[PDB]
Amino acid sequence: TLKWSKMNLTYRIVNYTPDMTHSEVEKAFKKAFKVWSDVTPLNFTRLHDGIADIMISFGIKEHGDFYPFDGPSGLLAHAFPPGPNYGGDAHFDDDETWTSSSKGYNLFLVAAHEFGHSLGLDHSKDPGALMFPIYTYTGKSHFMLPDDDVQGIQSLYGPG
Numbered sequence: 782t783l784k785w786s787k788m789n790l791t792y793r794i795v796n797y798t799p800d801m802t803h804s805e806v807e808k809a810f811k812k813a814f815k816v817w818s819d820v821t822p823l824n825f826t827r828l829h830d831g832i833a834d835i836m837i838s839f840g841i842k843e844h845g846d847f848y849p850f851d852g853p854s855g856l857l858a859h860a861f862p863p864g865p866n867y868g869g870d871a872h873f874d875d876d877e878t879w880t881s882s883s884k885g886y887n888l889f890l891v892a893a894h895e896f897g898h899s900l901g902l903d904h905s906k907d908p909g910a911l912m913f914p915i916y917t918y919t920g921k922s923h924f925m926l927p928d929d930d931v932q933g934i935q936s937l938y939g940p941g
């Protein structure tokens with residue numbers, strides 16, 4: 782995997798899970814990209830048409846990359862490293878129930894994690910890291926990006 786050569790990136794929500802309103806989905810993805818722009822010189826801008834650097838969709842079972850999803854629980858989402866077309870993209874398993882809280886899987890947390898992949902991060906060995914492979918909802922009131930994830934993203938793009 783390689784990093785992005787440019788600091789200004791774009792995304793597009795191609796489709797939307799019915800579990801949340803369009804604007805809850807948009808808020809979640811906005812807050813998730815902010816996780817990373819708040820600690821780098823990166824910037825994210827949403828488009829409503831055209832192909833953006835990061836194309837976001839909701840899928841279930843097989844869905845065109847032939848890395849199928851798998852139903853409730855299990856694989857929750859995945860994403861591709863930096864690069865053209867498919868690179869950057871983020872798919873979310875809509876067989877999960879997506880929520881703004883804990884009534885299912887929290888979309889903001891899974892998106893913040895997947896977008897770390899979109900930017901070149903690997904999974905972490907540190908179980909307290911956002912980039913750790915297993916999802917947890919620790920229910921804290923104010924999200925604070927763990928130090929392991931800060932260092933990994935700043936190792937690629939430096940700080941702000």
Ligand SMILES: CNC(=O)[C@@H](NC(=O)c1ccc(-c2ccc(CSc3nc4c(c(=O)[nH]3)CCC4)cc2)o1)C(C)C
Nearest residue numbers: 855856857858890891894911913914915916917918919
């Ligand atoms: C339920 N299934 C899984 O957890 C599987 N994982 C996935 O399919 C998958 C995709 C994306 C993620 C994921 C993993 C970890 C996190 C981080 S969750 C989290 N991180 C932090 C806090 C928190 O509360 N929750 C506070 C600081 C960082 C997000 C998505 O898991 C696992 C069995 C392989």
Ligand SMILES: [Ca+2]
Nearest residue numbers: 834866868869
């Ligand atoms: Ca892309």
Ligand SMILES: [Ca+2]
Nearest residue numbers: 852854856874
């Ligand atoms: Ca699943």
Ligand SMILES: [Ca+2]
Nearest residue numbers: 800875877878
């Ligand atoms: Ca769903």
Ligand SMILES: [Zn+2]
Nearest residue numbers: 844846848872
């Ligand atoms: Zn996919």
Ligand SMILES: [Zn+2]
Nearest residue numbers: 894898904914
């Ligand atoms: Zn992951």
